[PDB]
Design a protein around this ligand. Structure first.
Ligand SMILES: C[S@@+](CC[C@H](N)C(=O)[O-])C[C@H]1O[C@@H](n2cnc3c(N)ncnc32)[C@H](O)[C@@H]1O
Ligand SMILES: C[S@@+](CC[C@H](N)C(=O)[O-])C[C@H]1O[C@@H](n2cnc3c(N)ncnc32)[C@H](O)[C@@H]1O
Ligand SMILES: [Cl-]
Ligand SMILES: [Cl-]
Ligand SMILES: [Cl-]
Lengths: 239, 241
């Protein structure tokens, strides 16, 4: 089935503008997935059409009200089943494994907070899970939503050109360096093996550089990786 | 004099459109910072305006060419000193500590790749550092750039008003934050915790700190381990597990 990603946000047009750029917009154009911005302001009923108000506990910090977010999610669910993700720093830290897990859903609803956060009762009532884009804080869930959609949708066969099979994190490693023309640029030659080597020599050089980069930059990934005999010998030879 | 973030990208209009929205767009309006999309295609010099080409090593996977990126960065540097960040999965995993460190700079240039990545020679020549938005891969550096800018620019005093305080929030404190609530006091039979409605400032502080430690313990025990817990935090933790 076509993968669908609903984004509940006070800035739906931001979501539409973002997805008219790049390889992903072509996948939308041909129907491999679809992004569905939902205007949270459409689910207000008060005279001031209110989606945020002063929180409880003191001060004037703003928190997203529960009723509009509840109504927006219930509206989606009334038409078609969906998997509800609240974007929240308290959630699961988003990694390539998360993206592979979310890939299995055909219909995901992302709820975007603003200001101090989202009233936690509607999260308790409606969320299937919480996901954090990383160990940092941004002003809204919008950027976290589109980033996740990007990471998940690009795994749909046919979205990228004929590869996401050997890239960083997918392999449990950081990828080798890449180069293109010209062969010489400001005194730096492209490694000769990539110009004139055979397949196995290029594979060996890339695997070596990949392990090197991972050991130097992300030793924690090395510890988590189940190494092939060949990868382990290379790792030993750099230590 | 304000903070400036330049974004080298083949999609400058995407960057422009993103910062029309939300609290950051008001910060730009009153001149607390500025975002400058830099059109990488303006720095090609060949007849096909080429920013990417087939990589070396076999196949037709595309890699961003070194010359336009080099020319783009040297142009900025000829105008003003700037700190050059290559967006790349191999870089430092972006955290709140990273955002706090980058806040120090008054001018930051982000280099956005596409396709298989960026020719690593221009990275080696021009990058002051590489940063990864996280342990996953996206189609382009654009989203990583604007996300980092968001996390950094929101720390500029005055960008956020009374609507949110960045001094006490997730990760900044080493913890995950407590739950929040707003009107109405009762929603579908679920009541806002009474302490937030009628407790005093100290009672609210105690409850919030407890829920924060509980949430961090349940969701991110790794964060508990690396935080130097205060005497009070230590005891709350013990009075749980
Ligand atoms: C400024 S944040 C509120 C964060 C909250 N005060 C805290 O410290 O945990 C406003 C909105 O941005 C989104 N957001 C901010 N950081 C996020 C992150 N790391 N992961 C997912 N969403 C995030 C969330 O949807 C959140 O409701
Ligand atoms: C599809 S990625 C290529 C990544 C490379 N093939 C690898 O496996 O490491 C294309 C561009 O998106 C950006 N990008 C992808 N993932 C990123 C991340 N985790 N952090 C920062 N930038 C990222 C980079 O600028 C990169 O040049
Ligand atoms: Cl949850
Ligand atoms: Cl570097
Ligand atoms: Cl410690």
């Amino acid at each position: 089935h076509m993968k669908r990603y609903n984004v509940i946000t006070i800035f739906p047009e931001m979501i539409n503008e973002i997805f008219k750029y790049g390889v992903l917009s072509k996948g939308i154009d041909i129907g491999l997935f679809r992004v569905n911005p939902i205007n949270l302001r459409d689910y207000t009923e008060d005279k001031h059409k209110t989606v945020d108000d002063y929180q409880y506990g003191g001060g004037h910090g703003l928190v997203m009200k529960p009723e509009p977010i509840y109504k927006a999610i219930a509206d989606l669910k009334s038409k078609k089943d969906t998997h509800v993700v609240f974007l929240d720093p308290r959630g699961e830290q988003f990694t390539q494994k998360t993206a592979e897990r979310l890939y299995n859903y055909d219909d995901i609803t992302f709820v975007c907070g603003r200001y101090e956060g989202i009233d936690d009762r509607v999260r308790e009532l409606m969320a299937d899970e919480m996901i954090s884009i990383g160990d940092f804080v941004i002003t809204g869930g919008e950027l976290a939503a589109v980033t996740i959609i990007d990471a998940v949708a690009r795994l749909i066969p046919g979205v990228l050109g004929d590869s996401p099979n050997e890239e960083s994190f997918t392999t449990g490693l950081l990828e080798y360096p890449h180069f293109t023309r010209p062969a010489e640029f400001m005194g730096k030659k492209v490694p000769e093996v990539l110009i004139s080597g055979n397949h196995e020599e290029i594979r060996r050089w890339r695997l070596t550089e990949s392990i090197k980069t991972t050991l130097q930059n992300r030793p924690d990934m090395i510890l988590r990786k189940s190494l092939s005999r060949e990868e382990e010998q290379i790792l030993w030879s750099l230590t």
